[PDB]
């Protein structure tokens, strides 16, 4: 409703003050040094983080304006973890940086929209010497030790990320769950296994009792549901009793056909079972297909002129053996040649890439690893649930930072990319003086993290910087063991992927907030 | 509703406060070296904005009369927006002008309708000598050049424009959406398609590409959903025969329908396709007609004398090919007679003017656009959402004054044009004194955008004012250059029209607005 | 609730100062020299006016008395509206006299209800000098003359008024609609206009933009619905294929029955029309026989001795040309005899009576121009929406203002009529002093309005009222050119009924108020 409005300085100081809230709770978590955050939450008990982006989002103020500036700083740490998953307290430390320096050049009356231009230019020049820096990161030695970074300073976390990258490969699918006991664990699902149980408990063969053992079966795959009666059915099981047990696979089995289907297999006549099909509905349907040619059988289709009441022994797929429990279902081979099958994982390579981005990839490149690699599921050790939370978060975080490092490569971490290439843009100069500026400003900012690393040592970032500068290549500072010494050969990675993210997304918002000379809001 | 009344001077300066708290925000986004605005918003994050109309929108006072003066001048901005697109500040400036002096004028005493007249006079005198100095845009270069101005100095948008306007032609559509990735991107698809998939994946033809291509196909086009396929047969029987393919075009197709007609495709029966007619009930009843006089067929409409068993060869439409695939449909050369087309077109241009705008218009355009030229789509790159909402307006606003340039030619930029009338109404008197001060507070508030371009660039708006004023034509002050020389030259272009319109807007509203002897409104 | 009341003088005084605050609000818009009045809006912006009326009407206060005061006097805006249509602020202003110096001679101590016999009977003998006065308003000069008048002086309203009463005669029906552009347009539909539209688009003709034309056709009027009644046209269809088009005219024609309509005019047996009929149900029927003898047809009333099925060649009406669009439909010269027409002319004469003044007289009136004159519509044009609702105030004023002169004739504008009166009643007296005492307030307060057109210019109200009361006859003050002369041959006239009406319902509301010893109303 009735607004109130600032201008010009007055209004810049509100938004500064604002963002500086956000910035210095952010701040103390940065580095091996860095600190924990306490986020309370109104239903349960609090949360301790170090995770940037979690601390960003929880920063809310009165005094509209200064909520503002805050706002407005908390979309970098936002967009920061939405698209590389770490490094958003370093985009943070950038922004209030830029933001800082910027104001200031603002306040001495340079053109703002010029000093943004500045701005910009110096970063996409800066993302190019970034991404020439960059060194593949493929070994698994390398792996383990930006796994390590991201985890600050967990070896473990590292060593296990590279073991599971190492066994269900890149293009293997990786997730990470809480894990019942104090000692972190991996387990690692290969094959094809899909989560659904039996639908009639009856059905345990073994001294297993829960799981369900069928050797060399043959399967079956419909797309509608058995949910009338047994009747149709039964055409199929005179084929497939000849010499073999069965699986089934299809969206629901009833009891009209369960119950008729346990008599059988309990004597049993044939031994015998049935699951529904993996996923929701469609998705489902497209991975039926992926079992049929997995296990060289068809798929029923109710939709063509194939009907559910006829088929052949030769319509079964083949499995060298499958088993059963109340929450998978699992098959221990597919007797199809791989030309096919590799066809159809090839194949598949063409849907990976859509506009869904990640939300399709998860369960595709499941589906593509069900088919070719494995699945692997990572554990999270912890003795109480407030440690349980902060270390599953640094584990995510170190996933992340694999993945990234893996994809774009990785370049000296402890803030010294970053100077490194602002060395080599010092000779860049824009249109105008205020654009020069605007260079200068960003080519400062990029000193920020390494300053921030130091300071939380509570050690001259001046000194360490300026020892820093002094050197080449690699030589940085090791805030852990607070000596210098070349960062690759001390092991100490960040993923190009997330350096490069971090700037440009802290420069993206900086700029555009170093432009305002007015704020409207409401009356408090 | 107890209300509170104030008379004379006592009210009209608490309006002229609330007018100046309006415009002064406005106004820092006035020209190449104006600033941005931040504007909070409840739901989400701020917005950072230079666009005008955006600002004085969200603009509303505590002080019941300040706030009314401020509503009322609101209109302004809103009119200039909703008839131009752009220029919505430069009119809010102009407005804000012609209050100033006019009440000042009152203060003296003077008769405030004979001083409505005299201004109102002297701007019906403006819009002509405007419509002399109007020069038509053409070429694609100029077009570039009004682009880039009214984009904020972006050149690449007022490229893509010029580019754009060129590819798909007059009446051809132009429109922009959010992009995904960082660089700005111009999608062109020419000819008939419309956006709809094959309704069963069996259709597929030619794979992969998951495309269906039927080449030289007979259209079918329903109005209603087809359910039964016996209604559906006699025509099927007859294309058999015929030799060729069938594309089908209706509500829906149904089960049983989608069966029968894939089991036929399958078994190699017939080549066959079915998708779904374009819009809603009115909007893709609307377009069955133009797809089906696009390829000469007939529409069936159960609502007339036709029913669908009773069907003809002729009643079908033909097309050199059609292309499907799950996201849409393309028509490739329709045979239907440019006559018929042509007369379709003609007959949307009286539905073009219909007193409904935004999406009526453009909606219905796209309809034209299908049927005679082309559409195009510009996606417009960002690192973050914020950066988006700017790089997205500025580029919409480019969009509309391109148009506007196109419609109504182009005058001297820069404020210029205004400044440049004004002097040649400089003889112009009214009936009695006071009109003739109504003339002249006009003629005075002309410089208003010039002077306040210069005045956001922080230099004397008076010298610049001058010295402009010492020379004649199109000779100018170029702000970003921060130095003289000719506007057309250098390519600092105003569309016609919206500085046509910023000037009579502003003069409508203000006009009456200094005729205010009292003010009525509710009680604190 | 629990109440608050005040007795004689105390509470008298709270009366007026609310009676001064609605009437000092209003007055500022008298006269030529009047200005404007701005009016806060919650839902929209706020709206600017010079009618007197809508001032009044949005007055309320908070104390609870000053609000009783305000609240009554409303009323003879109110009345003067709601009879006149204009003179709603000098009727305000006439109140506020009487009631002041009313309320002075109640200090006095006479007797108030003596004092309201004495007003009201020096009213009613002026108002028998008015219709002396009053000379008739004829020629398009004069019409002109009054109708730019009560448009505060914009010439091109009276012309226009001029112009349709001219074209459509007095009779004819005027309406006023909001204007598609900035320039001010009169549109005359002479001969039988409908407003409904096609109900099938298919039957469209030979124009373009949706019209359809048919050539000496035979018209058909129904009571009834057809939609089952498909069967029972036939039998009339049989000459309608044999020697001409045919037009429908009915309740509603549904699907099915429509359907065959349009394939008949397609394939080519007959080209026929059907539109609903012009109103609600009783209303409507009525209209039907008007359309019947205008085009010497006959109606057919299911719900009389008239049967469906059953028709004839003979009985149907016939015309030159029909032609129909989305919105209107249009009959062309009737085959109906003059007799007839002339006849329902007549008859409708009883009807021109219609038991009541108000309600039915206006959609009449339409009926009885759409026979035998014709309907005209004005559209106003202005450049913004605050603009239009001020222009088309003032257009709807001189639109009743005309008329209304039209009716009762003019006499002497610019207040001098009543003062011219106020002479003539010099020599009146009443029963007692008392009474002569308020006789003596009507006639000193019919001053009051040329002395405050003069007060709005800012002039001596004392000298202009003395040496306009010096000269006779027409001799007045005209405040535009603000020099004196004859007023009807400045053209300068007040139509007798608003000046009449004026004057009577604020003696009315203001003799009754003076009478008040005591006041009740709730606490604060
Ligand atoms: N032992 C160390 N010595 C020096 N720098 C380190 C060390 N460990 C981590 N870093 C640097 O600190 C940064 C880690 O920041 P962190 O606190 O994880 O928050 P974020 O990852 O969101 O920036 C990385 O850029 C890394 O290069
Ligand atoms: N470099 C420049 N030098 C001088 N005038 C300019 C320059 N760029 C734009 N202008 C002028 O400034 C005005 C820009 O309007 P803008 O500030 O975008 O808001 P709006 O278009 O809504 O008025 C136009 O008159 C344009 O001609
Ligand atoms: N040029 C003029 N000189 C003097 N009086 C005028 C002039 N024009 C109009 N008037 C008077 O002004 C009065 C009407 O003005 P206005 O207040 O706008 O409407 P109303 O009072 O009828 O509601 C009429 O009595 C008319 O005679
Ligand atoms: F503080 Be982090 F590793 F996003
Ligand atoms: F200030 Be704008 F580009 F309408
Ligand atoms: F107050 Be008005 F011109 F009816
Ligand atoms: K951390
Ligand atoms: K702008
Ligand atoms: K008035
Ligand atoms: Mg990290
Ligand atoms: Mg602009
Ligand atoms: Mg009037």
Redesign the interface.
Known sequence: ???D?K?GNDARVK?LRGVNVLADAVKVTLGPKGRNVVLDKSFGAPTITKDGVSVAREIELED?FEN?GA??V???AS?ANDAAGDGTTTATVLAQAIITEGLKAVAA?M????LKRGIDKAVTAAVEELKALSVPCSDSKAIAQVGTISANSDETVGKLIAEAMDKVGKEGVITVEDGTGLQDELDVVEGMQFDRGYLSPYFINKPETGAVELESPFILLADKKISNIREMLPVLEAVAKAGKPLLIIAEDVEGEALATLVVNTMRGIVKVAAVKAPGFGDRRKAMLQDIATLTGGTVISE???MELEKATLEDLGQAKRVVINKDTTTIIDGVGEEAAIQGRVA?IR?QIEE?TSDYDREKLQERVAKLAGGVAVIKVGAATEVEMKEKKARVEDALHATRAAVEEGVVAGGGVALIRVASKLADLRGQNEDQNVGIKVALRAMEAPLRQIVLNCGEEPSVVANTVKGGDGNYGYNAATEEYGNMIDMGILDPTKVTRSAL??A???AG??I?????????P
Chains 1, 2, 3 share one sequence.
Not at 111 to 114: A, E, L, S, T
Not at 515 to 523: K, Q, Y
Request: with cysteine; charged share 20%.
């Open positions: 409703a009735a607004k409005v201008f938004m509209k503002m706002q407005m908390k979309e970098v967009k009356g053109n703002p929209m010029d939709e063509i002129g194949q063409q506009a440009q997304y420069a993206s918002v555009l907030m432009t305002t000379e007015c704020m409207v809001t409401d009356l």
